[PDB]
Amino acid sequence: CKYDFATSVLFTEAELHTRMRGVAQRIADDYSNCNLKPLENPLVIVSVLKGSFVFTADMVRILGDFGVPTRVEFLRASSYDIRGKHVLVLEDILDTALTLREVVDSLKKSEPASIKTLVAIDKPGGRKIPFTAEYVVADVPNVFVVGYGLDYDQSYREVRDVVILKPSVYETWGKEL
Amino acid sequence: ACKYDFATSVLFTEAELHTRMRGVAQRIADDYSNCNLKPLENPLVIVSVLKGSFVFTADMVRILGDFGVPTRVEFLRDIRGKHVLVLEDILDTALTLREVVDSLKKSEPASIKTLVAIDKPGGRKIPFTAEYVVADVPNVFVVGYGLDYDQSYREVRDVVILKPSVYETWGKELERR
Ligand SMILES: NCCCN(CCn1cnc2c(=O)[nH]c(N)nc21)CCP(=O)(O)O
Ligand SMILES: [Mg+2]
Ligand SMILES: [Mg+2]
Ligand SMILES: [Mg+2]
Ligand SMILES: [Mg+2]
Ligand SMILES: [Mg+2]
Ligand SMILES: [Mg+2]
C-alpha cells in the first residue's frame, strides 16, 4: 500500500473527483428549475466542520463548473438567514445519522425553501435511525477510514485519498495517550 | 478575452496558485525540518481564519502533506508547546491577523507564523509581514479561491478582478430591497 500508516486505499482523490462530477451533474439537473443565481439566489451550502472542509472546498468548485452558484456557511459537528433559500447540507461521513438528523431538523426551523444532504462517505450499515442522504459520493462498509478531511484524533485529514487506517496506528496511540 | 463575464481580469489561475503553493510548501518543509513534525505526536497546527480561507486551507494542507509536513486543523471565525501556522486567504489592513496572532500567543505555542494566499502590501493600516505569501496583488478588489463578494463567487477557481457592473448592479438591487 502506498501509505505506511494505511492498510489499503479505498478511494483515490481522482476517483472521488470523478464521483463528485457525477453528483454535480445530478445537482445541476435537480436545481435547474429553481433559477439559482449568484447574489440573488445562490444554493446555500451548509458545511459541517471540521471534517467536511476538504470535500466542501472541492465540491463548491465542481458545482461552479456545472453552473450551480453557491454561498457557504459553516457549522461545527461538536455542536451536534436561510428562510426561503435552497439549502444543501454537506457532511464528510454519514454513519449512525444522529448528527445529520439533528442538523437538518435544526435548519428546518428557519423555513428554507428546501433542504437536501450531500455526503462524501455513507456507511449505510451504521444507522441508529433511518436516514437517506439525497446525494452520496461513495459507500463504505464497517471499516474505520481517514483522509479527504476525515481524521483520527485530529491527524490524517490531509491525506489525499480515503484509506483504512491500520490498527497498529490507533491501538498504539490509545496506549500512549 | 476574460473567460468570466463577471470579471475584467484573471490575476492568478488555480494552476498558478498551486505552483506557487508548492514553492511555499518546500520552504515550510525546510523551515520546520528541525521541529520533528509527526502525525498524532507533533503535527503542525493549522489555524484557518474562516470563511474565506477554507479553499486555500483544503488545498494547502494537502500540498503540505505531499512535502512531508503533517498537520491538524482548527477554524476561527490547546496549542501550548505546539507549532502554529495561521492561514488567511487575504492579508490587507492586517488588523485581523494582528489580533489573531496576538490572541494565540497568549497560549504559549512553541512558535507561531503566518501563511497568506493573497497579500495586498499596499493595504496596511498597521505594520505586518506574513512569513509566507503565495501571491501579491495590487490595490484592487478580487474574488475567487475562497474570496467573496457579498458571499458569492468564492467557488470561482481563479483569483479575478470583479467587474464594477456586478457590484453597481447588486448595490442598486440592495438599495431597492
Ligand atoms: N469579508 C471579509 C474579511 C475582510 N478581510 C478581507 C477583505 N478584503 C480586502 N481586500 C479584499 C479583496 O480584494 N477581495 C475580497 N473578497 N475581500 C477583501 C480583511 C483582511 P485584513 O484587512 O484584516 O488584513
Ligand atoms: Mg471525471
Ligand atoms: Mg449520483
Ligand atoms: Mg461530521
Ligand atoms: Mg467526528
Ligand atoms: Mg480569511
Ligand atoms: Mg468577505
Asked whether A53 and A148 are in contact (CB, 8 A), the reply is no
- A29, A30, A95, A105: the catalytic one is A95
Asked whether A17 and A58 are in contact (CB, 8 A), the reply is yes
Separation of A36 CA from ligand 1 center, angstroms?
26
Q: How far apart are CA B90 and CA A89, in angstroms?
A: 26
Q: Output the CA–CA distances (angstroms, integers) from residue A61 to A20, A82, A153, A173, B27, in the order listed.
A: 11, 21, 28, 36, 27
Q: Indicate the residue type of B38.
A: K
User: Is domain B1-177 classified as CATH 3.40.50.2020?
Assistant: yes
Q: What single-letter DSSP state applies at residue A150?
A: B
Separation of B92 CA from ligand 1 center, angstroms?
6
A57 to B58: CB separation less than 8 angstroms, yes or no? yes
Q: Tell whether B108 is in a known binding site.
A: no
Q: In which element (H, E) is residue A164 found? A: strand A162-165
Separation of A60 CA from ligand 1 center, angstroms?
20
For A72, residues 6+ apart whose C-beta sits below 8 A from its C-beta are A44, A45, A46, A47, A56, A60, B51, B54, B151, B154
DSSP bridge partners of B84: B45, B112
Enter the C-alpha cell of residue B165: 457592473
Residue A153, chain B, CB below 8 Å: the answer is yes
Asked whether B74 and B49 are in contact (CB, 8 A), the reply is no
Q: Output the CA–CA distances (angstroms, integers) from residue B83 to A42, A44, A145, B28, in the order listed.
A: 38, 35, 26, 12
Enter the C-alpha cell of residue A68: 450551480
Pairing of strands B83-91, B44-49: parallel
The edge-to-edge listing of strands for the beta sheet with A86-94 is A70-76, A43-49, A86-94, A114-122, A135-139
Ligand 1 atom closest to Cα of B120?
Answer: 10
CA A10 from centre of chain = 16
Our answer on whether the CB atom of B93 is closer than 6 Å to any ligand 1 atom is: yes
Q: What is the dihedral of CA A44, A50, A54, A58, to 10 degrees?
A: 0
In 10 A of CB A97, how many CB atoms?
23
Q: What is the dihedral of CA B49, A117, A143, A161, to 10 degrees?
A: -50
Q: Is A48 helix (H, G, I), strand (E, B) or coil?
A: strand
Q: How far apart are CA B168 and CA A175, in angstroms?
A: 60
Listed by number, the residues of chain A in 75-94 with a beta carbon closer than 8 Å to a beta carbon of chain B are: none
Asked whether A80 and A102 are in contact (CB, 8 A), the reply is yes
As a whole number of angstroms, the longest Cα–Cα distance in chain A is 55
Residue A61, chain B, CB below 8 Å: the answer is yes
Ligand 1 atom closest to Cα of B95?
Answer: 23
Q: Output the CA–CA distances (angstroms, integers) from residue B66 to A70, B60, B152, in the order listed.
A: 29, 10, 31
Q: How buried is B158 (Cβ within 10 angstroms: 0-12 exposed, 13-18 middle, 19+ buried)?
A: buried
B39 to A63: CB separation less than 8 angstroms, yes or no? no
How far away is chain B from the Cα of A129, in angstroms, using its nearest Cα? Answer: 30
CA nearest ligand 1 atom 14, residue: B142
Q: Which has the closest alpha carbon to A9: A1, A19, A21?
A: A1
Q: Give strand ranges (E) for A69-155.
A: 70-76, 86-94, 114-122, 135-139, 145-146
Asked whether B68 and B78 are in contact (CB, 8 A), the reply is no
Q: Which has the closest alpha carbon to B59: A126, A161, A61, A57?
A: A57
A155 to B43: CB separation less than 8 angstroms, yes or no? yes
* Out of B55, B58, B170, closest to residue A39 by CB: B170
Ligand 1 atom closest to Cα of B141?
Answer: 13
Q: Output the CA–CA distances (angstroms, integers) from residue A146 to A153, A158, A169, in the order listed.
A: 10, 9, 12
Asked whether B25 and B63 are in contact (CB, 8 A), the reply is yes
Chain breaks in chain A (C to N over 2.5 A) after: 80
For B66, residues 6+ apart whose C-beta sits below 8 A from its C-beta are A160, B25
Our answer on whether the CB atom of B90 is closer than 6 Å to any ligand 1 atom is: yes
Q: How far apart are CA A96 and CA B95, in angstroms?
A: 42
Asked whether A75 and B54 are in contact (CB, 8 A), the reply is no
Pairing of strands B71-76, A135-139: unpaired
Name the one residue in this structure whose C-alpha cell is 442538523. Answer: A103
CA B126 from centre of chain = 19
In 10 A of CB A137, how many CB atoms?
24
Q: How far apart are CA B174 and CA B177, in angstroms?
A: 5
Q: How buried is A138 (Cβ within 10 angstroms: 0-12 exposed, 13-18 middle, 19+ buried)?
A: middle
Residue A57, chain B, CB below 8 Å: the answer is yes
Q: Output the CA–CA distances (angstroms, integers) from residue B27 to A51, B15, B55, in the order listed.
A: 27, 19, 21
Q: How far apart are CA A159 and CA B37, in angstroms?
A: 15
Our answer on whether the CB atom of B92 is closer than 6 Å to any ligand 1 atom is: yes
Q: What is the 3-state secondary structure (H, E, C) of chain B?
A: CCCCCCEEEEEECHHHHHHHHHHHHHHHHHHCHHHCCECCCECEEEEEECCCCHHHHHHHHHHHHHCCCCEEEEEECCCCCCEEEEEEEEECCCHHHHHHHHHHHCCCCCEEEEEEEEECHHHCCCCCCCCEEEEECCCCCEEECCECECCECCCCCCEEEECHHHHHHHHHHHHHC
| Resolution at which this structure was determined, Å | 1.8
Q: How far apart are CA A122 and CA A145, in angstroms?
A: 11
- Tell me the backbone φ, ψ of residue B105, rounded to 5 degrees: -60, -25
| Structure determination method | X-ray
Enter the C-alpha cell of residue A151: 481524521
Q: How buried is B140 (Cβ within 10 angstroms: 0-12 exposed, 13-18 middle, 19+ buried)?
A: exposed
Q: How far apart are CA B124 and CA B19, in angstroms?
A: 26
Q: How far apart are CA A108 and CA A110, in angstroms?
A: 5
